[model samples]
Target: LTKLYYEDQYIKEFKGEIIEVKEIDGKFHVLLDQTAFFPGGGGQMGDLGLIDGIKVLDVYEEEGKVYHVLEKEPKKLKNLQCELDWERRFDGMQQHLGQHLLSGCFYDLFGANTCGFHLGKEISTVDIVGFLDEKTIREAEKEANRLIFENLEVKSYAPSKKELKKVKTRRALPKTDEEIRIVEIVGLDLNACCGVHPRNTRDLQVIKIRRWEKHKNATRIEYVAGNRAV
Candidate 1:
């Protein structure tokens, strides 16, 4: 199992031990015993980095393990030292944590549960199960930024199975048997997530709801948070 450092600290660059390496469909999958690199999940994109001079292009998770896909096949670097792009990691954290706040605000104010989310290269999108008028979306966006200005603490904790049952989360828990990692935005949101996030709401520069449209019974809103919006 890889030790996820991002859960505790969003800003970290660490050396990791390579436990396994393999090639699949011309891409290399390097498994580290521990990683500060945040693999994409919970609608947040993954971080990019270099390993032994080879560029890490993407990240994916399988059976509780994260696999780093390289831009080109690299010579074996098992147990090698690597560095993550801290700027990119921080940006992802800001956007992800910002999204959590926005999503939670929607739930608290409008009872519109998030049905889906995606953090992409150019944009991020969130799906709400209930209908939202233009006025409501604008109001939610305003409230989200107000909370961001307050700079609430964003924390993480490992909850026991029993304790996990008590808190109401916006997203479903990952399908894993291991200890549940819960990310909490104090007095705002709490949910089971394994993505990197900012230390405080202030780190999130801004929350912008760029566009929104109806998709089936839900409304899909595309937006950007943090420096990306700026």
Candidate 2:
């Protein structure tokens, strides 16, 4: 299994090691032993960079391993160096961490559980159960910003099955016997998640809720964060 550096430290810029290189469907797929690159998951896009001088066109995860798709065939990089676009990675971290803060606030203050979430190219969305009046949303926004200002430490850990049973989370754990990764927003929320996030809450810039609407029995919130917010 590849060590996911982003889960613990989102600011890393040059921490990757390639394991293997192969071709499939006429495309090069480079496997890394460990990578800070965020493979597309949890509704967020993946990170893009170069592998041994070749341009990485796409990234994806499957069966606990990450695949880097290159625009042109890439040479084998066994035990070779890899770099990430720090600016892009940081942008993703800010937005993802920002979403977590917003989602946690909704659940804490209004019992509005987020049933779904998506991080798009232009905007991000969260689907919440229970009613969220305009006034209530505004209040939640205020609290969310407060937490951002607090700059609390974001923690992550891989827990054994026994430890997993001892904790209460915002959502049910994913169906996997594998060790679970937990992300904790100190004093605010604790949940099982597998995505990149910032080390400090202050790293999260402004989070703006662009729009929201009721769908059947849930409310869908559309929003943007960090650079996307600008």
Candidate 3:
């Protein structure tokens, strides 16, 4: 809920105050007054790193705040230095951007709806509501990375009722009337999301649909990108 990561996902270090702490189910859920961590949501993983020498075990969001879970409390309470495992954070960011481009291409080239996605530790998958032929898969992969090379700008925004109604999205409209976070890929994809992504598709380098098969009534494509692909 703290929006530092949203404002700029590249931040890897920062300082914060442990405003409160609670024991939840035998673990310490420490609340940070400010943080640059992205708590796991929207198919991404919760970040793990260090907070003022205390090992941050996980991060999660509740309401509009981010809670940094730690095994023990930091000795100091004020102006604690926090650093994210940047390698891990960047990996997730690249993969997430890869997903956006891949899913976006499917929707743009075909009338396919991305029904499912799983940001696995080693690989990722996107389930399309329609089947894919061999030729379609090849072209889709080619075009997907083409946009990545174009270095399209990636951005997120929360719009009002009137603005939201006028814009078209690749996926279903968000259900939250309070506010919705929409991640947009320049002129390509725009969908409701709450995940961290790189500033440009060029960061992804490329993505490959490794394999595909018929799913229940859809098609599932196994893929990898960024470090995993390269």
Candidate 4:
């Protein structure tokens, strides 16, 4: 099955064939031969939209297959026209990209590694390996916004093994032999991430760090990006 989300994050509408369908919990779980919907991963939620005019309640991935959970079965079986919740999809991209910039900034400024992240409906949180003073946090925030203004190019791809050796990632790679997808923010950040993102940093508009508190041995920073920040 083709994962259109990775191929083109900006795709808002697409047509896919219904290759399989299962009834679970009185709802239909559909498998499309091609999908623009992103199954939840890497702190971002799954997509919500419509499949053949049927309400897509949720989407998820299991063993490399993307499944669309719908309220009812679709009337068509092939060439099912689908529409993504653009506002919701873009918001997720903004937040996910903002997270990459913020995490990179923190590490660049204070060597604080981002150990965790959660993209909530209204807010998001990123946990740093260690706490930094408010002053330092402010500096990171400022730097991130500045980069956003720069509108640096963002790229994602699975590089060859030889090319991977030259790239510097902030965290350790997963313990899998499968191809690794690298998300690079121009000269800023290079990390292994699976979430969909904008093509440029400016799309995020702005990033605001709301608050921070100690979480065990780390610090949890609450934040919002782009439209959510407004």
| Tens-digit per-residue lDDT, 1-230, candidate 4 | 79998899999999989988899988999999899999987788889999999999989888889999999867788877899999999999999998899998998878788888888998899899876799998999999999999889999888889998887875788988667888899988898988898999999999999999999988899999999989
lDDT of 4: 0.90
What would the TM-score be for candidate 1 when compared with the true structure? 0.82
Ranking by lDDT: 4, 3, 1, 2
Q: Tally clashing residue pairs in candidate 3.
A: 0
For model 1, how does the per-residue alpha-carbon lDDT over 27-138 read when each residue is reduced to its tens digit? 8888887776677766667778887667788877788788888767666656666778877887777777767888899998988898888777688888889788999999
Write one digit per residue (lDDT tens) for candidate 3, span 1-230: 26588777888999888888898886788888878988887889978899998888888888778888888856798998999999889888888878788888888898677888889997888888876799988888999889988889998776777887887864577566457778899988887888888888898877888888888988888898888887
Backbone clashes in candidate 1 total: 0
Candidate 3 error regions (>4 Å): 24-26
lDDT values, one for every candidate: 0.79, 0.76, 0.84, 0.90
Instruction: Give TM-scores for every candidate, taking all chains together and pairing residue i with residue i.
Output: 0.82, 0.87, 0.91, 0.94
Best by lDDT: 4
What is the total number of backbone clashes in candidate 2?
Answer: 0
Clash totals for all models, in order? Answer: 0, 0, 0, 0
lDDT of 2 by residue, 108-186 (tens): 8987777887777677788888778899888888898888888888887777678878888756788875667787899
Candidate numbers sorted by TM-score from highest down: 4, 3, 2, 1
